[model samples]
Target chain A: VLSPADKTNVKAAWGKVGAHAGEYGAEALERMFLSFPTTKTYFPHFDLSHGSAQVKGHGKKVADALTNAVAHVDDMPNALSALSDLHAHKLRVDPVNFKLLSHCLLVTLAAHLPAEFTPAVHASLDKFLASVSTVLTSKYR
Target chain B: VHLTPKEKSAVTALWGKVNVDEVGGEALGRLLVVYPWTQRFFESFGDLSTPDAVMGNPKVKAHGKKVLGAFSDGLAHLDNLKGTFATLSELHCDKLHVDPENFRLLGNVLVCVLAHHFGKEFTPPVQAAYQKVVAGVANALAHKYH
Candidate 1:
């Protein structure tokens, strides 16, 4: 459960994240793939090369999804229901990858936006990511 | 994987108060409620269309008990988590096709359940200690994937 302050922190931090969402998403995915090679299995069709266009484009999509999540902070489940279905049914993404990606996302944001990613913002974002993860994997049963 | 003596004691003391059957079922039910995708794995259990349905289902209750039983085993052998969870790891990764991440998810949900039940006693220190325990359990459960 996110507190009122948590929502404020998240919105503020995302305001700083702004145009860099795609770049940060790409970096986070890259970090996940490199740090946990097992995650590469999910992107076998992609070039998986450094700074591949496919990766960058996918990163944009990830950013867009997160942007959507931020927009509907109070109703993430309803907001991400379609995405959850896609991941659970079509993609069948292992739920664990969400945590991996969330961790990398945190690192990416902290590295790039140190001033915005303070401990308070970090805690809020962690809860936010965890909520999103739960929503995405909720359909997994 | 390292738990200070105080952390261990905090976890053990809180764990002792848990009503295993009730908490286990509630945690698993809450997981299904929050993460509907997980229902894919339990399709055969019947009628998990609603939170109440998932919570009331007998099979879910039974399985939840088993899940918590594993956690009990984990707590008992914190020093040998890898060995303790070896067989379960293989069963989940190899035969069950359970995503390793679900263990972490369930662990988190279990913590929430503990928080709900223990309230004020689920202090930050205690929660932190349980987080380590959960991480250790999650890591041990994912051993087969490595």
Candidate 2:
């Protein structure tokens, strides 16, 4: 569903966002946990508090995977199959959690890139993330 | 496991050679033949007993590619080792209920295939790196299964 230009723009935006990957990743994860506490069920032992070690470790994980996703935007399904399999087959995670994380990621990006987070960029990323959510959620049914 | 950059590259080179559909089919075939208990997970393999029949089955071949794809990704992204392992953890432990030992067996069989393919280059470090990869993934898949 992404155009050539959309792919190019998304990568460019990620170039800027990737610099502060840890911060943004943590922020998005924090936002998800705060807003949707039930998602914490997956990580029963995690310390969800702000700036905690567990939060930082898992936040870095989200960031790393997202970075991989951005790097391979053209091959999102192949790029993310491991993650999709984990969520779908193993953990049996509810698909809603992925959408929620995407939202939080967008919010985090906008906050981090106040000037570069243009409306067009927002739309492109939104489309890209939606496709990602669809692939991840495809296994549920 | 903490792998040096060179070590990761060395293992990746060998993994690239053997992590293909044909090789994956052979490995899966071996898994079914050597470990008959695993057949319970697949309806397609229910009555098939011979290795030739197991490998020839379209479903087995397709699933082989999917698993080979996962192995390829696992080697490619050792930088995110924990996250990679965590995903496998949820998939095997939570969803499929695959016994962790089965993962170990799969790893051993795959490494043997790669060893046969790579011959001399599958050195101590390369072998150790692959072992770490299998151990790490198996560790994750072993988590929290009831």
Candidate 3:
């Protein structure tokens, strides 16, 4: 669903988030648990408290997944096929929670990168998250 | 969100007349049929290869009763759904690892069953109220994830 401008904006914003992607992912997860507590059901075994090591570790994993999606923006379905299978078949995570986490991720990005998270960039990232979510939940049926 | 008085009454009234086992079994059976991937979670239930098998399975019937009973419990504690479903959330998230999506799916299936059986009584407003109830229960049941 991304336009050419959307791709450019996503690339630019992700570039700024490059080094601290894990930190942002952690922040996004924290926000998700706080604002949409039900989304936490996917991480029952996780230590969800602030600055927990497991949260940081999982956050890194989430960031890496997002980075992989970014790297293959045009081919997200194929790029994230393994993750899709894991989430849809193995993890059984509710697809709605993806939207919850995506919301928190956008809020985290905007809060930390005020100058970079312009409206255009926000829309781009939102589209990117939706695409990733679609890929991840594709095998649910 | 707190349901309006009318909404609560509507849900309570309809729930009072529901045939829990019949509707519940149908809802769960339809969920398995419509989303065959979800059947993986019910491997112990046995022989779900056909719609007839899924609908006729004893385990599916028993579990469906339990599922509907959970909904009844939610109706009783509309104001305290989180607390009422706290243990369920833990079990599903920690032990069962049931996908959160299945909750929503089952809820929708339950709604469809209601519409099918209730006919004209399942009006738009009543449907709206029930949607809130189902959404609330779904959220409560999924609260223990992250």
Candidate 4:
């Protein structure tokens, strides 16, 4: 899967999302994965040149998006609408391929996340990604 | 076209048992059906008739009314040309143990699968779908605040 954003973008965005949003928590993904043993195998080839760049890049992408998104938690309709249009129309991507990326992004999370993955997080990520992927890859339809 | 009860059950049952094999297979099947290839999605089933035999699936709405209807249309119009393969590919892919970006690898692989099966350059669709899905996943998981 393609990496989404670089660390600079996300960290900068996180600075705006505020502490109350707990949005900065996403910044921990790369470290969390590197720290855990069970998940290390998931990134078996992750070295400074190859793995770190990808992890950091993708982590930032998610963080930036999340940071931007947390700003509108109370108005998810607007948030979703904006995203739907941005990815579906502006991006003009394929639907199935979008789903493929979604899979990697999340597995990256599951592989690294500390013990924080609650059943709710598990279910939410799965369902949410599926819908988001649908919108993104809808370029064909 | 709205998924009738039986159709919903069929979809759900399929989801319940969908595996990497099934997901990969369905993805392959789509490539062949759409382009020009083998469509091995049916091969994994051994019989590939209907999926009800192995699962006692409990139904949930098929994600959306439109999705269910579209699936029905695909089936009715194609006359079993594309049964629950769409749903099967989705369920299998959805169950992958990674994030949105990770799924792209699967799609990347699927691209080759499509190319191998269809023998036509299918990279454009593959690349397009992968990025969009990743962003869409970002949007979806972003909602979780996880």
Question: Pick by TM-score: which candidate is best?
Answer: 3
How well does candidate 2 reproduce the true complex, by DockQ?
0.01
Better of 1 and 3 by lDDT: 1
Report model 1's TM-score to 2 decimal places: 0.57
- Residue A26 local lDDT, model 3: 84
| lDDT (C-alpha, whole model) for all candidates | 0.89, 0.76, 0.87, 0.37
* Tens digits of lDDT, candidate 1, A1-141: 999999999899998998999998888998988887757766779987896999999999999999999999999999999999898866667777889999999999999997888898999999999999999988765
Candidate 2 residue-wise lDDT, A72-134, digit = tens: 887888999988887766665655577789999899999989887899899989888898887
Off by over 4 Å in 4: A1-59, A70-74, A80-83, A134-141, B1-146
**Candidate 1 CAPRI classification by DockQ:** incorrect
Candidate with top lDDT is 1
Q: Model 4, B38-125: lDDT tens per residue? A: 2232344343222232111111111223222433343343323224344443454454323344333333333333233332222222
For candidate 3, lDDT tens digit of each residue in B1-146?
A: 47889988887898888997799899999998888667767889999889999999999998999999999988889889999999999998777767677788889899999999999999999999988888988899888874
User: Residue B84: error of model 4 in Å?
Assistant: 25
TM-score per prediction, in order, is 0.57, 0.49, 0.69, 0.30
lDDT of 1: 0.89
Mark the regions of model 2 whose C-alpha exceeds 4 Å error after superposition.
B1-146
The per-prediction tally of clashing pairs is 17, 4, 7, 34
For residues B9-119, write the lDDT of model 1, one tens digit per residue.
Answer: 999988899998799899899988887657767889999889999999988998999999999999999999999999999888776657777888999999999999999
Q: Give the winner by DockQ.
A: 1
Q: Residue A123: error of model 2 in Å?
A: 0.5
Local lDDT at A94 for model 2: 55
Higher-scoring candidate on TM-score, 2 or 3: 3
Evaluated against the true structure, the overall lDDT of model 3 is 0.87
